[PDB]
Write a protein that binds this ligand. Structure first.
Ligand SMILES: Cc1cc2nc3c(=O)[nH]c(=O)nc-3n(C[C@H](O)[C@H](O)[C@H](O)COP(=O)(O)O)c2cc1C
Ligand SMILES: Cc1cc2nc3c(=O)[nH]c(=O)nc-3n(C[C@H](O)[C@H](O)[C@H](O)COP(=O)(O)O)c2cc1C
Ligand SMILES: [Ca+2]
Ligand SMILES: [Ca+2]
Ligand SMILES: [Cl-]
Ligand SMILES: [Cl-]
Lengths: 221, 221
């Protein structure tokens, strides 16, 4: 049968998922649990099946130490967290690129289906979403897809009883340069999108503070 | 106690979550289940607690019909899905805006804490992430946060046994103009980010096709 939760269980999960700034350095996530977290990212949906992401798992302590200088949003977490993921997004993911040829093959499209798909992707990028305005608009489209993978990794971790924190608080140019200089990706192909820490909290879970549902929802009947 | 799943259950959930293009028009999501889905969006994390989203629930059939002309990615789904959400993202969410004053209050910051937070947000936007390059770069930052809310709504729906589909396949300028002309938001304040349909599938769940874990993960020990 299928895995299914009650509404109460779903809400519990989303109140357990919180941004963890204080991790217990004595508790490490198992290799099995961490592989499951990564699989939540891998299995995430993405526009046109583009999967425009790479997951860098930064366990090396010397590299984490170097990041402290320019990563104010995770300074405390770098020494204490079990695992750190830096998510990259694909650069220059144009409809007519070799990257997109591979997207289509993972679907198994023949020449005619590829022709129709290419026309759809061109319309999506050029006219519907206007992504071809600049390199940054096209990069940011791929980056949006990586935030889906991020969200699913945080939620999957929480479902396994593992704490996490999403991270934007770092100097992106310095982070890109540092990780490229370490040989972790080709900077012509990918650039840093967002990061996340994972581990076990050393403090209580902070209560949710959010705008009310009536503030954020408008119903059009 | 806390809600917790096994690795096998988490993976099942992420294989059950699939992009549903074919919905059974006879099956409607209950008001209670749909409120739970919306709460998964509301409870989502967001950079600096910005929550830069609105959720428009488009149930009106005449409005759905109008969208068909310019929404190729959800044409089939518009007539058959139970619920449709169009997610908006905040425009011009500058660190020094009234929008950001409210972000800080939901945290309860006094004048000195606000001063420190404003300095952090200014550094994040101006220098770390370089969001102030253009209106679009700043909008796309908020839009990225809305993709977290999207992902969590899809996953929460799947956990409740409800099918969904994320949607970018529409003309954004036409969609913005149409929904603003209906009075659903102030177009000076928000613009369309991404959409999603929800309902019960009329076909089998399609098997996952993804790049292998070894393709997308790089481990830095
Ligand atoms: C993309 C993103 C980036 C964030 N960056 C940071 C960060 O650098 N450091 C940090 O401590 N929190 C960071 N946060 C956490 C937010 O401040 C947090 O989600 C928000 O205040 C709501 O709290 P909650 O996640 O505990 O519900 C980030 C959140 C998101 C989604
Ligand atoms: C942001 C986003 C936008 C998408 N837009 C559409 C769309 O307009 N129409 C559609 O049928 N599928 C759309 N998809 C679904 C993707 O094609 C799908 O996620 C991908 O092919 C993987 O299939 P799966 O979600 O079933 O695992 C979109 C996905 C995402 C994440
Ligand atoms: Ca099962
Ligand atoms: Ca419980
Ligand atoms: Cl690479
Ligand atoms: Cl508004």
């Amino acid at each position: 049968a299928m895995t299914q939760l009650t509404r109460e269980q779903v809400l519990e999960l989303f109140h357990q998922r919180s941004s963890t700034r204080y991790y217990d350095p004595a508790k490490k996530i198992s290799d099995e649990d961490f592989e499951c977290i990564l699989e939540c990212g891998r299995l995430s949906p993405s526009s046109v099946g583009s999967e425009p992401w790479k997951f860098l798992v930064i366990q090396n302590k010397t590299l984490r130490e170097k990041m402290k200088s320019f990563s104010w949003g995770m300074m405390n977490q770098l020494d204490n967290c079990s695992h750190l993921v830096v998510i990259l997004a694909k650069k220059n993911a144009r409809y007519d690129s070799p990257f997109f040829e591979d997207v289509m093959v993972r679907k198994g499209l023949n020449a005619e289906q590829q022709q129709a798909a290419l026309a759809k992707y061109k319309a999506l990028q050029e006219e519907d979403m206007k992504l071809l305005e600049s390199d940054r608009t096209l990069f940011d489209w791929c980056s949006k897809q990586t935030y889906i993978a991020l969200a699913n990794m945080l939620t999957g971790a929480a479902a396994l009883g593992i704490d996490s924190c999403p991270i934007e608080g770092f100097h992106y140019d310095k982070m890109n340069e540092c990780l490229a200089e370490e040989g972790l990706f080709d900077p012509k192909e990918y650039a840093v999108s967002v990061a996340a820490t994972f581990g076990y909290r050393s403090r209580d879970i902070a209560k949710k503070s959010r705008k009310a549902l009536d503030e954020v929802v408008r119903w059009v009947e």
